Design an enzyme around this catalytic site. Structure first.
Site, mmCIF file in Angstrom:
data_model
loop_
_atom_site.group_PDB
_atom_site.id
_atom_site.type_symbol
_atom_site.label_atom_id
_atom_site.label_comp_id
_atom_site.label_asym_id
_atom_site.label_seq_id
_atom_site.Cartn_x
_atom_site.Cartn_y
_atom_site.Cartn_z
ATOM 1 N N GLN A 235 0.796 -1.230 0.000
ATOM 2 C CA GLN A 235 0.000 0.000 0.000
ATOM 3 C C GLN A 235 0.841 1.300 0.000
ATOM 4 O O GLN A 235 0.335 2.382 -0.323
ATOM 5 C CB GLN A 235 -0.984 0.001 1.180
ATOM 6 N N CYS B 168 -5.142 0.444 3.484
ATOM 7 C CA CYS B 168 -5.296 -0.966 3.875
ATOM 8 C C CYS B 168 -6.733 -1.461 3.645
ATOM 9 O O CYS B 168 -6.954 -2.584 3.166
ATOM 10 C CB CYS B 168 -4.897 -1.146 5.348
ATOM 11 N N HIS C 48 -6.120 -1.489 11.340
ATOM 12 C CA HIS C 48 -5.571 -2.021 10.097
ATOM 13 C C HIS C 48 -6.519 -3.054 9.524
ATOM 14 O O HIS C 48 -7.145 -3.803 10.265
ATOM 15 C CB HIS C 48 -4.208 -2.636 10.386
ATOM 16 N N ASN D 124 -1.487 -9.637 4.368
ATOM 17 C CA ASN D 124 -1.305 -8.233 4.683
ATOM 18 C C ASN D 124 -1.043 -7.477 3.359
ATOM 19 O O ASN D 124 -1.002 -8.094 2.276
ATOM 20 C CB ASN D 124 -0.148 -8.099 5.673
HETATM 21 C C1 LIG Z 1 -5.072 1.317 6.851
HETATM 22 N N1 LIG Z 1 -3.988 1.623 6.198
HETATM 23 C C2 LIG Z 1 -5.556 2.306 7.817
HETATM 24 N N2 LIG Z 1 -6.625 1.786 8.646
HETATM 25 C C3 LIG Z 1 -7.979 1.811 8.472
HETATM 26 O O1 LIG Z 1 -8.459 2.371 7.509
HETATM 27 C C4 LIG Z 1 -8.862 1.150 9.505
HETATM 28 C C5 LIG Z 1 -9.314 -0.218 8.965
HETATM 29 C C6 LIG Z 1 -10.219 -0.919 10.002
HETATM 30 C C7 LIG Z 1 -11.380 -0.032 10.435
HETATM 31 C C8 LIG Z 1 -10.907 1.363 10.882
HETATM 32 C C9 LIG Z 1 -10.089 2.048 9.779
HETATM 33 C C10 LIG Z 1 -9.709 3.474 10.167
HETATM 34 O O2 LIG Z 1 -8.577 3.713 10.531
HETATM 35 N N3 LIG Z 1 -10.638 4.502 10.054
HETATM 36 C C11 LIG Z 1 -12.094 4.341 9.884
HETATM 37 C C12 LIG Z 1 -12.692 5.384 8.933
HETATM 38 N N4 LIG Z 1 -12.247 6.791 9.111
HETATM 39 C C13 LIG Z 1 -12.977 7.873 8.482
HETATM 40 C C14 LIG Z 1 -12.583 9.213 8.587
HETATM 41 C C15 LIG Z 1 -13.320 10.220 7.974
HETATM 42 C C16 LIG Z 1 -14.457 9.927 7.242
HETATM 43 F F1 LIG Z 1 -15.171 10.889 6.649
HETATM 44 C C17 LIG Z 1 -14.861 8.613 7.118
HETATM 45 C C18 LIG Z 1 -14.134 7.602 7.728
HETATM 46 C C19 LIG Z 1 -10.808 6.884 9.470
HETATM 47 C C20 LIG Z 1 -10.327 5.869 10.502
HETATM 48 C C21 LIG Z 1 -4.450 3.074 8.593
HETATM 49 C C22 LIG Z 1 -5.389 3.801 7.681
#
Ligand SMILES: *C(#N)C1([N]C(=O)[C]2[C][C][C][C][C]2C(=O)N2[C][C]N(C3=[C][C]=C(F)[C]=[C]3)[C][C]2)[C][C]1
Length: 215
Positions: free
Chosen positions: A19, A25, A162, A182
């Site tokens: 990634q 992820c 993640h 992964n």
């Molecule tokens: C990967 N690389 C990353 N991790 C994620 O995306 C994880 C995956 C598991 C669920 C939680 C998710 C996460 O970090 N986010 C959920 C959605 N978020 C969000 C923010 C703003 C918006 F308008 C909508 C959603 C962010 C946090 C490390 C990034």
């Protein structure tokens, strides 16, 4: 259900991707699950476009993170997702450039595993195929994984940070595990994979946010 399952052996799993710096992820996890269902439904394994998801799933935050269910719902409502070849990965969010001409897969919805239920997760892997899951991957011990069945009591099942792909499960030298793909490149882990403890009180939150697409 079978004692062990490994969808890599049946050509349901594409190569391990990297990634890069982007927080995508969730998009690699989503594409992995979609890829599994596409192979099952059509007999063809191909790389689907995580960039399409990063750029076009407005409910998620692109390289800021996202939920795999929002990704499946997008593919469903969009009436498709492009191949990697048609919509290559560039590792930064850009404008949505989805092209129906490069469409490689459709989605008819998604199913979620009940929160915390590893038995249900096992059943889903056995019956359906690879399943998108979220975990706490923040520990240094996770970074340095090389072999064996990973378990660390400090893994926080309330900190799902993640997204990865469960492509199977089994037992190694008496230790039950999940086979996890992964998206940190083939150089990380064991050829890009980790075996993670199964039935050990939901270690790393493996069964707290699991889902798969319908096709
Ligand atoms: C990967 N690389 C990353 N991790 C994620 O995306 C994880 C995956 C598991 C669920 C939680 C998710 C996460 O970090 N986010 C959920 C959605 N978020 C969000 C923010 C703003 C918006 F308008 C909508 C959603 C962010 C946090 C490390 C990034």
């Amino acid at each position: 259900a079978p004692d062990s399952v490994d969808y890599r052996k049946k050509g349901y799993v594409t190569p391990v991707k990297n990634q890069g710096q982007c927080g995508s992820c969730w998009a690699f996890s989503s594409v992995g699950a979609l890829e599994g269902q596409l192979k099952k439904k059509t007999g063809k394994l191909l790389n689907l476009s995580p960039q399409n998801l990063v750029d076009c799933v407005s409910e998620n935050d692109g390289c800021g993170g996202g939920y795999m269910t929002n990704a499946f719902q997008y593919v469903q409502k969009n009436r498709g997702i492009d191949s990697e070849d048609a919509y290559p990965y560039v590792g930064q969010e850009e404008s949505c450039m989805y092209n129906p001409t490069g469409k490689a897969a459709k989605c008819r919805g998604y199913r979620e595993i009940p929160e915390g239920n590893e038995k249900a997760l096992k059943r889903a892997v056995a019956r359906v195929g690879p399943v998108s899951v979220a975990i706490d991957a923040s520990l240094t011990s996770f970074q340095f994984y090389s072999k064996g069945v990973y378990y660390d009591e400090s893994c926080n099942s309330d900190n799902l940070n993640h997204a990865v792909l469960a492509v199977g499960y089994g037992i190694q030298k008496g230790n039950k595990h999940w086979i996890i793909k992964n998206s940190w490149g083939e150089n990380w882990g064991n050829k890009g994979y980790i075996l993670m403890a199964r039935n050990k009180n939901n270690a790393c939150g493996i069964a707290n946010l699991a889902s798969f697409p319908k096709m």
